Each structure stands twice: as structure tokens, then as C-alpha cells.
């Protein structure tokens, strides 16, 4: 473990990459208070009755 940290510091021309997303938990991301608070009212249900 010690030398793993050491060698990844010692690699030249390479740094540990930065991900394009910060939180990978889309459940928290979506069901967070901000999204749901600014969110619009649902326009329907998952399974919708057929009228005619």
C-alpha cells in the first residue's frame, strides 16, 4: 500500500485522472431536494389508461 501511493506519485507525465462526474449516485442526484423542488409537476403515470 505504501509503495502503491509512492509509485503513483512517481509516474512522470501522468496524474490520477479527474472524473467527468463527481457524484456517481444518480438516485441521490435526482431525488435530491434541489431537483425535486425546482421540478415540474408530473404529466402522467408510468402505465396510462387508454381512452378510446
Amino acid at each position: 500500500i505504501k509503495q502503491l501511493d509512492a509509485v503513483y506519485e512517481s509516474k512522470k507525465g501522468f496524474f490520477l485522472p479527474a472524473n467527468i462526474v463527481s457524484q456517481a449516485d444518480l438516485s441521490r442526484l435526482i431525488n435530491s431536494t434541489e431537483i425535486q423542488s425546482v421540478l415540474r409537476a408530473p404529466k402522467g403515470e408510468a402505465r396510462t389508461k387508454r381512452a378510446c
Partner: protein
């Protein structure tokens, strides 16, 4: 920084304390792994020819 426990020869924790070396937080990219593995698995072959 999170912590991992060290285990002795008997399988029981020793009480030692170790920190993740910051590389286990790197992004997981199966496509990049696929590309690199494909090339690096061809990199061993011996030539054949009639």
C-alpha cells in the same frame, strides 16, 4: 481519507491502520480497459506465415 484494516497470519485483525493510497478512487472505465487490454494482449503474439 478512508481506512483499511490489516490482517495477521491467523486471519484476525492486528489493529494496524492504513489509508487508501488515493488510486482506488480513480474512475472505472471499462471501454478504456477494453481498448488497452485488446492491444496489450495482441502485444505477445509470435508471427506465422506460409
Amino acid at each position: 481519507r478512508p481506512t483499511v484494516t490489516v490482517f495477521g497470519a491467523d486471519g484476525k485483525p492486528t489493529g494496524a491502520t492504513e489509508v487508501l493510497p488515493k488510486v482506488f478512487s480513480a474512475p472505472i472505465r471499462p471501454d478504456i480497459v477494453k481498448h488497452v487490454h485488446t492491444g496489450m494482449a495482441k502485444n505477445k503474439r509470435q508471427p506465422y506465415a506460409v
